[PDB]
């Protein structure tokens, strides 16, 4: 079986974090998960633990009530997170609520199970619009906004930089498909041609991404910008295919939140990602998490089982006498090693902690609306009713960890803002992400001089020169036209269609109207 991160308490809350990577396509049926993950894994687990410690310490939030947890590996895989959710359901101390998981596609698979047992789920990174259906997903909520905004923002970015003929790639799954189809419905309505829409799984082989990159160079040179509604490793695979083929620098990738500022995606293939514009969600680094995490040591921390593996992996050494020692690494772990070296905090850590607080404050509102005087759990919440917990969680009005009031709408979604990033070079051979814009409630603000300072053109046809040249569409696509001139008697009515002057009249010098022949 899989080891779990256990913590006792008067109320145990479930958690699903991607401690390991998705199992290799070879051993998928075996469900043998891949390498350990820090930001989406270990860090989120320790955040769960410490946040529950704080909720216990806090006398205002849930007084006389201890919060325990059962933290299980999601592996960013539907089947693995579903087996572990079954291990949550195994009882029917019961699991009151569930936090996570990461991928919207996996979150649906989990929700489908949890809803049957009235267990409210709160996702930190699942953004898909389909999860806004509360008839399909009654007991689902998320602290991040629907992707109907992020798609609109991506469309607005395409609009601002006068891009019309674009290629479109998305990760095969609910997140990618929902986002891409919303981008299709919005861009096409706003007059943006989609050269071709491509879908690929994140764990597809090298040859598969090579084929994808070749199919992307099929539309070159017209369609250079690639609207990517791709999670992480999909963008990474694209960059690695650009290294393999040599098609680097020829495209411009417009990534979604799957590649917000993730260094694990661009590290090692920096030149290939240069110029890429991506979308992040408004999550300021949670101050007190770094103070807890960076002080952690493998000798001290003994509640996270994977911390031994993760410590041996991040430093690539073997913890000499420790229990879960792995002989693989040729080096031995020194006492000088510390996490502060090359520390990169999880981008969505704020949402993780805010979701844990969402569950806590929902339980507290239910506590006050059922056991007013009794300090702690009374006989009315023995047992805790899941339906009442959902009704109290939807009506939660609290101030978040980022100093911003978190609230939930009718569809169980939370409001959100986005930061637009750019992977440019900050110096010779050095590359890093930089904030270049923002998107909130429709308004898109950008610093246009920071992105290019150099400009890129991704259109299928250059605007017809003013004089008399009309826009005549080609064989198939709208944005593809052939600038054809007008007859001497014809004046240009509108950009698209030409109109002829009647007998005696003749087109004016500006070719906007007619004028009598002298």
């Amino acid at each position, epitope marked *: *079986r899989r*080891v779990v991160a256990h913590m006792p308490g008067d109320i145990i809350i479930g958690a699903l974090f991607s401690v390991h990577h998705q199992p290799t396509v070879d051993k998928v049926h075996e469900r043998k998960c891949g390498a350990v993950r820090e930001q989406y894994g270990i860090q989120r687990v320790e955040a769960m633990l410490h946040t529950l410690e704080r909720i216990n310490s806090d006398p205002t939030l849930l007084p006389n009530i201890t919060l325990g947890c059962e933290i299980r590996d999601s592996c960013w895989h539907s089947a693995v997170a579903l087996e572990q959710s079954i291990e949550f359901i195994r009882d029917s101390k019961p699991i009151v609520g569930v936090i996570g998981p990461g991928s919207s596609s996996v979150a649906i698979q989990v929700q489908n199970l949890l809803q049957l047992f009235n267990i409210p789920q709160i996702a930190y990174s699942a953004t898909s619009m389909d999860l806004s259906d509360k008839t399909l997903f009654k007991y689902f909520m998320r602290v991040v906004p629907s992707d109907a905004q992020q798609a609109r923002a991506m469309v607005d970015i395409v609009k601002r930089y006068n891009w019309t003929y674009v290629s479109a790639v998305h990760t095969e799954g609910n997140y990618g498909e929902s986002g891409m189809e919303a981008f299709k419905d919005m861009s096409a309505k706003e007059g943006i041609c989609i050269a071709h829409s491509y879908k690929i799984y994140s764990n597809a082989g090298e040859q598969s991404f090579d084929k994808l990159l070749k199919k992307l160079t099929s539309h070159l040179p017209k369609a250079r910008v690639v609207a990517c509604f791709c999670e992480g490793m999909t963008v990474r695979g694209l960059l690695m295919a650009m290294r393999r083929l040599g098609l680097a620098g020829e495209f411009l990738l417009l990534g979604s939140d799957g590649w917000a500022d993730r260094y694990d995606v661009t590290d090692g293939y920096q030149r290939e990602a240069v110029g890429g514009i991506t979308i992040k969600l408004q999550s300021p680094d949670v101050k007190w998490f770094d103070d807890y995490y960076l002080k952690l040591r*493998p000798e001290t921390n*003994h509640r996270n*089982p994977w911390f031994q593996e993760f410590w041996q992996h991040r430093f690539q050494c073997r913890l000499e*006498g420790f229990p879960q020692e792995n002989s693989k690494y040729n080096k031995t772990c020194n006492s000088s090693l510390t996490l502060k070296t090359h520390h990169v905090q999880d981008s969505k850590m704020g949402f993780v902690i805010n979701a844990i607080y969402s569950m806590a404050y929902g339980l507290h509102n239910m506590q006050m609306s059922l056991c007013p005087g009794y300090a702690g759990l009374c006989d009315a919440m023995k047992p805790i009713d899941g339906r009442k917990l959902l009704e109290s969680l939807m009506k939660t009005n609290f101030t978040g960890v980022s100093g911003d009031t978190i609230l939930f709408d009718e569809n169980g979604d939370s409001p959100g803002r986005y930061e637009i990033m750019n992977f440019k070079e900050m110096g010779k051979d050095y590359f890093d992400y930089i904030n270049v814009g923002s998107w909130d409630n429709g308004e898109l603000k950008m610093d246009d001089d920071e992105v290019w300072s150099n400009i890129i053109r991704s259109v299928c046809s250059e605007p017809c020169e003013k004089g008399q040249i009309k826009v005549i569409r080609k064989g198939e696509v709208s944005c593809c036209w052939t600038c054809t001139p007008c007859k001497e008697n014809e004046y240009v009515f509108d950009e698209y269609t030409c109109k002829a002057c009647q007998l005696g009249s003749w087109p004016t010098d500006d070719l906007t109207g007619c004028d009598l022949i002298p």
Partner: nanobody, 123 residues
Framework: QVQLVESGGGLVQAGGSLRLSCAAS????????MGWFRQAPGKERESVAA????????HYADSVKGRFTISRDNSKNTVYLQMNSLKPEDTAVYYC????????????????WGQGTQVTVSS
């Protein structure tokens, strides 16, 4: 909730050999490390040998170095301690204990015990 059973002990002559077994109940024995330690009457308890949760990497006390060997078959879900050329100072109650999460052995947090097998080495 894992339960351990010790076996293999008894009584042996001076310089003889004796092999020790310890079996665990339930899965996730592969997730726990294992360490045998002995305790004699009056004397305080001494950590004998230890093997990592994955196996392969082993540690021994200076007293039993070059004399004992600890091993484990995870498929059998069992750990073993072969005590070649025993001495009279080895007479004690040997215990087998599981430890997920420790530090450099002998510093481990043992969070499961076993019954205990009595080993008597006659002069």
């Amino acid at each position: 909730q894992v339960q351990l059973v010790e076996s293999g002990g008894g009584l042996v002559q001076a310089g003889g050999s004796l092999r020790l077994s310890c079996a665990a109940s339930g899965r996730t024995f592969t997730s726990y490390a294992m360490g045998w330690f002995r305790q004699a009457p009056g004397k305080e308890r001494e950590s004998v040998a230890a093997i990592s949760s994955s196996g392969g990497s082993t540690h021994y006390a200076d007293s039993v170095k070059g004399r004992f060997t600890i091993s484990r078959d995870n498929s059998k879900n069992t750990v073993y301690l072969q005590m070649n050329s025993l001495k009279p100072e080895d007479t004690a109650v040997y215990y087998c204990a599981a430890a997920m999460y420790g530090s450099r052995w002998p510093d481990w947090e043992y969070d499961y015990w076993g019954q205990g097998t009595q080993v008597t080495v006659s002069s």
